Amino acid sequence: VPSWPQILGRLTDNRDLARGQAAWAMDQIMTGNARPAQIAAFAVAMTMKAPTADEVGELAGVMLSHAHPLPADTVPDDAVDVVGTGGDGTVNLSTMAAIVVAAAGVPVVKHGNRAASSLSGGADTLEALGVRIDLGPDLVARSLAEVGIGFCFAPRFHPSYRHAAAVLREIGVPTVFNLLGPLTNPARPRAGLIGCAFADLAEVMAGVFAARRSSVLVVHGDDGLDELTTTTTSTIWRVAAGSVDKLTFDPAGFGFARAQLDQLAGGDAQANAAAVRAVLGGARGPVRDAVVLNAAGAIVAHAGLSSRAEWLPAWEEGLRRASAAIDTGAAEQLLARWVRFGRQI
Amino acid sequence: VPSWPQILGRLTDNRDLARGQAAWAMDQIMTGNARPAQIAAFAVAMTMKAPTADEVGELAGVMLSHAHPLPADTVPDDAVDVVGTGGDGVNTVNLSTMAAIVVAAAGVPVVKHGNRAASSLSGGADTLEALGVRIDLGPDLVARSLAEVGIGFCFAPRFHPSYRHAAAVLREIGVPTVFNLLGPLTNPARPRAGLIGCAFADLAEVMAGVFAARRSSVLVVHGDDGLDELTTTTTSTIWRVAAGSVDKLTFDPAGFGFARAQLDQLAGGDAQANAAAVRAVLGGARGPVRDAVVLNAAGAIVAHAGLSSRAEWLPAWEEGLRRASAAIDTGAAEQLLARWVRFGRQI
Numbered sequence: 001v002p003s004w005p006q007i008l009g010r011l012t013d014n015r016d017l018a019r020g021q022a023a024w025a026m027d028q029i030m031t032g033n034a035r036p037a038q039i040a041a042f043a044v045a046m047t048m049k050a051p052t053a054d055e056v057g058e059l060a061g062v063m064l065s066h067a068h069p070l071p072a073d074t075v076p077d078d079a080v081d082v083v084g085t086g087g088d089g090t091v092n093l094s095t096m097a098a099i100v101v102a103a104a105g106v107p108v109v110k111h112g113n114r115a116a117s118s119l120s121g122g123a124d125t126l127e128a129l130g131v132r133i134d135l136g137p138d139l140v141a142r143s144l145a146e147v148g149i150g151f152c153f154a155p156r157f158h159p160s161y162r163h164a165a166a167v168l169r170e171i172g173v174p175t176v177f178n179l180l181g182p183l184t185n186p187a188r189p190r191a192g193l194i195g196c197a198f199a200d201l202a203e204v205m206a207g208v209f210a211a212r213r214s215s216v217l218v219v220h221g222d223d224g225l226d227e228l229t230t231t232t233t234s235t236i237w238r239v240a241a242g243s244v245d246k247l248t249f250d251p252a253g254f255g256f257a258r259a260q261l262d263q264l265a266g267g268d269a270q271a272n273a274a275a276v277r278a279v280l281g282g283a284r285g286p287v288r289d290a291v292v293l294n295a296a297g298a299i300v301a302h303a304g305l306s307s308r309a310e311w312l313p314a315w316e317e318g319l320r321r322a323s324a325a326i327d328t329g330a331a332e333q334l335l336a337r338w339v340r341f342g343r344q345i
Numbered sequence: 346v347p348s349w350p351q352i353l354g355r356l357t358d359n360r361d362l363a364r365g366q367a368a369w370a371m372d373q374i375m376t377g378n379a380r381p382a383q384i385a386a387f388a389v390a391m392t393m394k395a396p397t398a399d400e401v402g403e404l405a406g407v408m409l410s411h412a413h414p415l416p417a418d419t420v421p422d423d424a425v426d427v428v429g430t431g432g433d434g435v436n437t438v439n440l441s442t443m444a445a446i447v448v449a450a451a452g453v454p455v456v457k458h459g460n461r462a463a464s465s466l467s468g469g470a471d472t473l474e475a476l477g478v479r480i481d482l483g484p485d486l487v488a489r490s491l492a493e494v495g496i497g498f499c500f501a502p503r504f505h506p507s508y509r510h511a512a513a514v515l516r517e518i519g520v521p522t523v524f525n526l527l528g529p530l531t532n533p534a535r536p537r538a539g540l541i542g543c544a545f546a547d548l549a550e551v552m553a554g555v556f557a558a559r560r561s562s563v564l565v566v567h568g569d570d571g572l573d574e575l576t577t578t579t580t581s582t583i584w585r586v587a588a589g590s591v592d593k594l595t596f597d598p599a600g601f602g603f604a605r606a607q608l609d610q611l612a613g614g615d616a617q618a619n620a621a622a623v624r625a626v627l628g629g630a631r632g633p634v635r636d637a638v639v640l641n642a643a644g645a646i647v648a649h650a651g652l653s654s655r656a657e658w659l660p661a662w663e664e665g666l667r668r669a670s671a672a673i674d675t676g677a678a679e680q681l682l683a684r685w686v687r688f689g690r691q692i
């Protein structure tokens with residue numbers, strides 16, 4: 001009933017897939033039953049034909065059903081993710097924002113890869129900071145228990161994605177597959193701060209999150225950043241109670257001086273490492289501001305699990321707690337505790 | 346300057362390529378420097394972004410410039426081709442191939458380009474091969490076939506060996522792309538006229554565009570029933586290409602007295618079955634198959650007339666129908682096929 005020619009032909013006719021087809025196509029790829037030419041066609045055609053939440057949801061689902069889980073009852077019910085799609089065109093604001101959030105006591109489980117794969121970045125910079133990025137399910141859990149944060153290395157948790165990843169490296173261009181990182185976190189946290197460079201596709205990511213009933217803020221800086229920016233306003237899709245809701249967000253309302261795009265910027269892994277140490281050590285400046293802002297974001301999303309949570313006080317509490325996790329040195333200390341953890345195994 | 350991410354990114358942005366990019370891409374493909382994923386992505390991306398005449402011409406041109414030519418001065422200025430894209434999803438009898446033989450028998454030089462089937466049960470080359478005709482001849486001997494029989498057959502895999510890299514890849518995706526247009530645009534003998542079949546109603550105008558740029562006299566045809574031939578079951582759309590301009594027409598056989606046929610009457614089988622249908626028609630069997638053969642054959646004869654400006658549409662069709670029918674009725678077509686087989690076995 002399903003088949004590659006059927007599905008590819010339907011995509012090249014500019015038609016949404018029937019429900020199930022996207023899933024079948026991803027399952028073919030996962031099971032190794034997909035020629036690298038079919039993977040490539042699907043990936044491009046799914047992109048040029050504007051992909052829908054259901055379709056993206058089916059891809060992420062199938063991927064997740066082949067992924068290694070974390071052991072039962074080790075992921076707190078209120079964990080969050082802090083991550084972006086990448087393809088921005090930075091300093092690793094997410095990485096820092098994630099450390100600050102965990103430091104404030106919100107459990108964080110992150111998903112990522114090394115740069116230029118379809119499943120997000122940040123592992124390089126984490127590796128340059130001394131953190132062990134590729135641990136199995138059991139140790140990611142133990143890290144989340146002992147440290148307050150764990151990192152799920154995509155190759156480790158999605159070994160069947162191998163093929164799709166190789167193919168996508170060669171076409172060397174953004175596709176619908178670049179949305180899968182935030183959506184295929186093996187630990188399935190119910191909250192998060194999710195950045196997206198591709199503005200059209202943010203609302204699609206948001207809808208996938210709505211269907212999971214997650215409490216998530218998908219964020220797009222109106223300067224094109226895959227984070228909440230301080231260059232200008234941002235667009236936020238507030239995902240709550242299964243509903244999506246598009247908003248405009250201006251950090252001026254909380255006293256954030258406008259910064260230039262090129263101050264939140266210019267980062268290879270060894271440099272990004274140094275920016276983290278600078279900033280976690282108290283270096284004031286536009287990078288700190290944007291880390292503080294995005295961390296508050298994740299903490300607001302965490303508050304949104306409560307369902308009695310109000311938007312503006314949630315942001316103040318968020319800004320307050322992230323500021324304090326930095327200024328107390330709890331964040332710097334958490335990073336250190338994270339590195340030590342990785343050495344004591 | 347140019348790269349796969351540059352070119353693939355532009356296409357995915359739903360943007361027309363810059364001049365030279367399509368050519369660079371096709372040239373990477375032809376020389377073996379393109380990865381399978383790059384090829385598939387390009388072909389699919391180029392299809393979903395409506396491709397332009399310039400783009401398809403650059404693909405076709407790179408291909409031609411890598412193909413094996415026929416020798417100097419062996420192709421008449423007025424040679425015609427009779428060939429389609431294939432991929433109509435109907436396994437009809439081989440209309441183009443039967444048309445080609447009739448046309449050569451009317452005294453119009455035919456240099457046909459061809460291939461085995463990709464989806465149907467028997468392609469032109471398959472059916473020709475089943476008849477005793479040699480499909481695998483090289484350039485020199487294709488030239489000699491044309492001189493001695495009046496017809497030559499250029500087997501695409503033989504003249505376009507560097508297409509091998511794109512062939513396997515495109516087969517694997519199993520869906521038609523812009524690449525499915527190249528066969529009829531890459532006849533290595535570069536004849537200036539033809540009747541060119543297109544299975545895809547939405548890409549047929551682009552093919553006409555490519556032919557218009559070369560200043561060929563060509564009718565690009567699509568049956569409104571989906572045939573990559575002139576049909577007899579209904580009307581056909583014709584992009585007439587002449588003096589560098591394209592001109593869209595609708596064509597109705599009823600006007601030249603043709604009864605409406607049913608698609609299943611034009612249906613065919615494997616290479617042996619399709620070879621028996623050619624023998625039946627060239628033998629004088631009246632009926633719908635013959636009807637469609639005569640019709641297309643006139644079609645090509647009209648494209649041939651169109652090499653000369655001041656040829657008029659109606660009298661050229663009428664003259665075309667007389668000559669196609671006569672070619673069959675006098676035994677001339679049936680004899681040329683025999684001479685053609687004889688020629689193969691005598692080298």
Ligand SMILES: O=P(O)(O)OC[C@H]1O[C@H](OP(=O)(O)OP(=O)(O)O)[C@H](O)[C@@H]1O
Pocket residue numbers: 427428429430431432433434435438439440441442443459460461462463464465467468469470528542
């Ligand atoms: O496999 P398909 O996609 O169905 O295509 C069937 C055939 O039609 C095309 O050529 P040609 O113009 O010689 O067609 P003919 O069979 O009508 O002679 C193509 O080269 C195939 O041989």
Ligand SMILES: [Mg+2]
Pocket residue numbers: 083084085086093094095195226227
């Ligand atoms: Mg990020």
Ligand SMILES: [Mg+2]
Pocket residue numbers: 084086088090091092093094195226227
């Ligand atoms: Mg970023």
Ligand SMILES: [Mg+2]
Pocket residue numbers: 428429430431440441442542573574
């Ligand atoms: Mg044909």
Ligand SMILES: [Mg+2]
Pocket residue numbers: 429431433437440572573574
């Ligand atoms: Mg046909």
